Amino acid sequence: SWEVGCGAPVPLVKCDENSPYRTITGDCNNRRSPALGAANRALARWLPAEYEDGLALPFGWTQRKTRNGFRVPLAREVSNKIVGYLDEDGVLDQNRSLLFMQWGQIVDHDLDFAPETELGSNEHSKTQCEEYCIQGDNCFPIMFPKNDPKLKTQGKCMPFFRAGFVCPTPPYQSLAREQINAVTSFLDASLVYGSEPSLASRLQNLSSPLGLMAVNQEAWDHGLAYLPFNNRKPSPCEFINTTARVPCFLAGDFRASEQILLATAHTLLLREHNRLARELKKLNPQWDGEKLYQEARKILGAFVQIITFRDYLPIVLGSEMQKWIPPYQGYNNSVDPRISNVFTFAFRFGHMEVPSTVSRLDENYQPWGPEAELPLHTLFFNTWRIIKDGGIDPLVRGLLAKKSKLMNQDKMVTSELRNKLFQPTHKIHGFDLAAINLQRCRDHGMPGYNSWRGFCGLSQPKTLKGLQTVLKNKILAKKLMDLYKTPDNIDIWIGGNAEPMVERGRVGPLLACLLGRQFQQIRDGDRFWWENPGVFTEKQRDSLQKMSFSRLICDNTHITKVPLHAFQANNYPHDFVDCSAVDKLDLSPWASREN
Numbered sequence: 001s002w003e004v005g006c007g008a009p010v011p012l013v014k015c016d017e018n019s020p021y022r023t024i025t026g027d028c029n030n031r032r033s034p035a036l037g038a039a040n041r042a043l044a045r046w047l048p049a050e051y052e053d054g055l056a057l058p059f060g061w062t063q064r065k066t067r068n069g070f071r072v073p074l075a076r077e078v079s080n081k082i083v084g085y086l087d088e089d090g091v092l093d094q095n096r097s098l099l100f101m102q103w104g105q106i107v108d109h110d111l112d113f114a115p116e117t118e119l120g121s122n123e124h125s126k127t128q129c130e131e132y133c134i135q136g137d138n139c140f141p142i143m144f145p146k147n148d149p150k151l152k153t154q155g156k157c158m159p160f161f162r163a164g165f166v167c168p169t170p171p172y173q174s175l176a177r178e179q180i181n182a183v184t185s186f187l188d189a190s191l192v193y194g195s196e197p198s199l200a201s202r203l204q205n206l207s208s209p210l211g212l213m214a215v216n217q218e219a220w221d222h223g224l225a226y227l228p229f230n231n232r233k234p235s236p237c238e239f240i241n242t243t244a245r246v247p248c249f250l251a252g253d254f255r256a257s258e259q260i261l262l263a264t265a266h267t268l269l270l271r272e273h274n275r276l277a278r279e280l281k282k283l284n285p286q287w288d289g290e291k292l293y294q295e296a297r298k299i300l301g302a303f304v305q306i307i308t309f310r311d312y313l314p315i316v317l318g319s320e321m322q323k324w325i326p327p328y329q330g331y332n333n334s335v336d337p338r339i340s341n342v343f344t345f346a347f348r349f350g351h352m353e354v355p356s357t358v359s360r361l362d363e364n365y366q367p368w369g370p371e372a373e374l375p376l377h378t379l380f381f382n383t384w385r386i387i388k389d390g391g392i393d394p395l396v397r398g399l400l401a402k403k404s405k406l407m408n409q410d411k412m413v414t415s416e417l418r419n420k421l422f423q424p425t426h427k428i429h430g431f432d433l434a435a436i437n438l439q440r441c442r443d444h445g446m447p448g449y450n451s452w453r454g455f456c457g458l459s460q461p462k463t464l465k466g467l468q469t470v471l472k473n474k475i476l477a478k479k480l481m482d483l484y485k486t487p488d489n490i491d492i493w494i495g496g497n498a499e500p501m502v503e504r505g506r507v508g509p510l511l512a513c514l515l516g517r518q519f520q521q522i523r524d525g526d527r528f529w530w531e532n533p534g535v536f537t538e539k540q541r542d543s544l545q546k547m548s549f550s551r552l553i554c555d556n557t558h559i560t561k562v563p564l565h566a567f568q569a570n571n572y573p574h575d576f577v578d579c580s581a582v583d584k585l586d587l588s589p590w591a592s593r594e595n
């Protein structure tokens with residue numbers, strides 16, 4: 001008895017079988033169990049969900065029920081006491097480019113998404129929740145503590161709706177609540193091509209047989225393309241400057257326009273497709289619109305994988321890289337490719353790497369204009385800055401020349417993300433990502449810190465002094481303890497991120513384990529992993545090993561000077577070489593001789 005069945009509300013079709021191209025929804029990868037890794041399924045559970053009433057209520061819901069005999073601290077008070085800081089001076093990561101942070105957010109959005117509950121294409125709940133903070137059904141407000149400034153100017157709470165959950169929708173029972181993953185589990189650039197047929201089609205240019213993606217027809221960037229605008233009205237990107245009226249962009253993943261620098265990456269990727277598409281058409285004049293689409297799409301997914309696994313992971317995990325992700329040994333069909341629930345919180349470490357400003361640089365990498373550098377908080381859902389203020393180049397240079405914020409125990413998340421966040425639904429720039437990240441842990445029903453420490457075979461502290469050693473920080477450990485009473489209750493997000501960083505890495509033991517586990521799993525379980533023999537020919541593989549994020553920039557913007565290693569900190573003149581010195585992708589092995 002497993003309850004094994006629940007395969008209801010989810011899109012399903014026949015397995016193309018023996019087809020050399022990934023299905024959009026992620027289905028048909030695992031032949032013997034077709035729905036593994038597919039979009040719109042439940043986040044996998046490495047450990048049993050822990051809810052207040054065992055079944056679905058989060059801890060904190062019933063204001064009288066304890067978790068391990070203690071009251072869980074209000075999400076925002078954990079923010080105020082531990083996560084906040086004021087001095088942005090000294091904070092930058094001295095050997096990681098702002099692209100380091102940015103790539104993590106791409107990978108993240110390629111792997112997982114637990115959307116919010118709706119139930120109101122018009123309803124008094126998307127207003128009874130924001131206007132009166134009444135807890136009920138899917139409205140689980142973030143109450144403000146006594147003494148929070150925000151009390152004085154904002155209200156009684158920050159509205160917050162519980163995340164979507166499998167099987168049905170409506171008021172639900174039976175089993176433990178499981179959240180949905182509306183995105184595919186495999187590193188496959190689903191953020192560029194979509195997870196859904198439908199949406200996947202919308203994205204395509206099917207007015208012509210060139211196998212191109214749709215591009216904006218209203219604005220251009222020095223003859224280079226932009227992402228299409230969205231049909232959607234209302235539109236937050238429009239609401240951000242009622243005078244300008246520039247809607248959000250349309251991409252394979254709905255979160256694309258959340259911040260300007262993310263929209264930038266999305267558009268460099270689209271560009272890479274179209275570029276690949278044309279080139280392919282040149283070498284093989286007789287290929288299909290579909291054929292061109294899938295083939296470029298396959299080369300692109302191979303790209304996102306190579307940079308992630310060869311260039312990005314080695315530096316998030318550091319020395320702990322070798323221990324969780326041993327060299328590739330072939331596709332294993334028994335390895336479960338599904339993205340676990342805890343990963344979606346483990347991967348949120350990147351939030352502590354986001355700095356407070358964003359720069360635009362001129363051709364010599366000098367401040368572009370008088371208002372070059374801007375507060376990150378005016379950039380949430382900001383699209384007018386790209387379209388009407390220089391385009392992409394000024395913004396990509398910033399990613400290569402600036403640095404990320406470095407995780408620090410006394411400085412965790414910049415106030416830009418911590419007090420001034422713009423949520424696409426409501427009106428202000430007054431939300432808190434750290435309190436939300438904490439509240440979301442409880443909604444998803446996550447086990448405590450020690451449960452995960454135990455899961456990774458690491459010591460489990462039970463007293464102040466024990467927590468002091470694990471964290472190697474005396475004061476931090478005291479605050480955490482005064483708010484939680486026991487480490488067993490410490491929310492995984494704040495717990496995993498409070499640990500000191502491993503050698504050469506950028507996350508601690510617990511996080512290196514949970515991420516390290518996830519990545520080995522989504523690589524060993526992917527039938528279409530690029531090295532998996534039979535997916536790309538040997539000569540094609542040799543061609544792909546030369547890809548670099550640097551070249552991607554050369555071939556897709558008008559930048560002519562770039563670093564060789566793009567994630568490490570690079571100083572301009574000196575660390576920047578001319579594009580000609582950077583290896584190009586030789587698309588010649590993709591040639592097709594008929595006779």
Ligand code: HEM
Pocket residue numbers: 101102103104105108112113114115258259344345346347348349350351353354380417433436437440
């Ligand atoms: C500064 C720019 C960023 C903003 C404004 C931002 C904002 C957000 C917001 C609002 C959420 C959803 C909160 C909720 O309703 O639960 C979210 C989720 C998340 N963020 Fe970020 N984020 C940013 C950067 C990053 C980066 C750099 C990373 C990692 C390297 C990251 C990783 C994640 C992860 C893993 C999720 C959960 C995804 C899911 O399963 O749905 N974010 N972010």
Ligand SMILES: *[C@@H]1O[C@H](CO)[C@@H](O[C@@H]2O[C@H](CO)[C@@H](O[C@H]3O[C@H](CO)[C@@H](O)[C@H](O)[C@@H]3O)[C@H](O)[C@H]2NC(C)=O)[C@H](O)[C@H]1NC(C)=O
Pocket residue numbers: 095315565568569
């Ligand atoms: C700034 O970050 C750089 C990357 O973390 C780092 O340089 C890297 O150091 C590692 C470890 O010593 C080396 O890794 C590579 O070693 C051989 C070549 O030496 C390669 O064949 C392997 O693939 C392996 O990855 C590299 O020497 C180097 N990485 C690269 C890509 O150049 C610096 O240590 C950091 N700067 C400071 C001051 O610490």
Ligand SMILES: *[C@@H]1O[C@H](CO)[C@@H](O[C@@H]2O[C@H](CO)[C@@H](O[C@H]3O[C@H](CO)[C@@H](O)[C@H](O)[C@@H]3O)[C@H](O)[C@H]2NC(C)=O)[C@H](O)[C@H]1NC(C)=O
Pocket residue numbers: 240241243244245384388
């Ligand atoms: C809302 O979006 C507006 C653009 O979509 C933006 O206005 C634009 O920004 C500045 C003025 O704030 C102007 O830049 C400069 O333009 C000429 C050069 O061509 C100079 O001579 C001017 O002195 C000016 O500094 C843009 O041309 C301007 N356009 C308009 C119609 O005002 C606003 O800044 C945005 N404001 C908000 C609320 O975010």
Ligand SMILES: *[C@@H]1O[C@H](CO)[C@@H](O[C@@H]2O[C@H](CO)[C@@H](O)[C@H](O)[C@H]2NC(C)=O)[C@H](O)[C@H]1NC(C)=O
Pocket residue numbers: 205206207208210212213214215216217
């Ligand atoms: C889909 O089809 C073609 C692909 O090239 C696009 O039309 C060209 O775009 C520019 C628009 O300024 C012009 O040079 C011509 O009108 C077109 N040239 C060609 C090749 O005929 C069109 O933009 C594409 N539509 C979308 C949204 O992708």
Ligand SMILES: *[C@@H]1O[C@H](CO)[C@@H](O[C@@H]2O[C@H](CO)[C@@H](O)[C@H](O)[C@H]2NC(C)=O)[C@H](O)[C@H]1NC(C)=O
Pocket residue numbers: 332333334335336
């Ligand atoms: C494929 O991955 C699975 C997932 O871990 C592995 O299956 C294990 O096989 C070993 C035998 O070497 C057993 O002792 C383990 O208990 C199995 N674990 C699970 C979860 O099945 C295995 O490493 C891989 N299979 C092969 C032989 O390639």
Ligand SMILES: [Ca+2]
Pocket residue numbers: 110111183184185186187188189190191
């Ligand atoms: Ca994916």
Ligand SMILES: [F-]
Pocket residue numbers: 359360366367372373
């Ligand atoms: F600057």
Ligand SMILES: [F-]
Pocket residue numbers: 377378429
């Ligand atoms: F503002």
Ligand SMILES: [F-]
Pocket residue numbers: 579580
């Ligand atoms: F060149």
